[PDB]
């Protein structure tokens with residue numbers, strides 16, 4: 001069976017697309033406002049050197065902080081999100097922030113050279129830039145694998161925004177209060193996605209796609225935990241806080 005999208009489901013999709021268009025600048029025109037990226041010589045991938053300088057951390061921390069603000073804006077436009085208590089809204093945002101960033105970053109990621117290309121050379125982010133920010137391959141490898149995997153799903157923009165919305169409004173987040181309400185909101189989004197794929201996504205892929213998308217949400221949970229471990233190590237580095245931002249300190253602290 002291929003039920004058609006209800007008027008409400010169409011509205012939800014239009015709302016999410018508009019929300020994404022208002023919060024994701026495909027030209028990356030604000031990036032020059034961030035603290036400048038610095039790339040020091042480290043072909044050897046020296047952890048000692050990387051930690052002593054954390055040359056790319058100020059720039060990436062500003063990028064991530066900027067992105068969190070956008071995700072907050074996006075979340076506030078998700079149908080139903082405002083119905084949640086302020087406390088639940090914050091718990092969901094803090095717990096999914098890094099995951100949504102990884103998801104939305106897929107738009108700038110390119111398999112041409114496996115990098116996130118946001119402009120000229122200065123704003124082309126490679127795995128080497130992540131290491132220069134203090135991270136290890138335990139996070140980087142899975143991250144790239146995840147990016148390529150998501151790219152291959154060839155998601156329609158409609159599927160992309162729904163996946164981000166579903167990621168945010170998850171009832172199984174530590175600390176949530178009204179899980180039932182959150183699940184109700186998420187189910188409404190999941191059904192919309194499931195329905196969209198069935199009557200709008202042409203084969204090969206009319207099916208199987210939903211499961212693959214759900215699996216990516218699971219992958220995101222693992223990356224979230226790995227990033228958390230790495231962030232902890234990073235926080236031990238003296239003077240690290242100055243290379244971050246208040247928003248970032250709260251979200252990952």
Ligand SMILES: C=C1/C(=C\C=C2/CCC[C@]3(C)[C@@H]([C@H](C)CCCC(O)c4nccs4)CC[C@@H]23)C[C@@H](O)C[C@@H]1O
Nearest residue numbers: 060061063064067101102104105108116125130244248
């Ligand atoms: C943000 C966005 C973009 C790219 C994403 C990237 C490339 C550079 C490195 C990133 C930011 C990965 C890096 C794992 C995160 C590590 C940094 C970090 O622990 C911290 N930082 C502040 C406090 S701790 C995750 C997503 C990757 C560009 C554009 O698509 C907008 C998108 O929101």
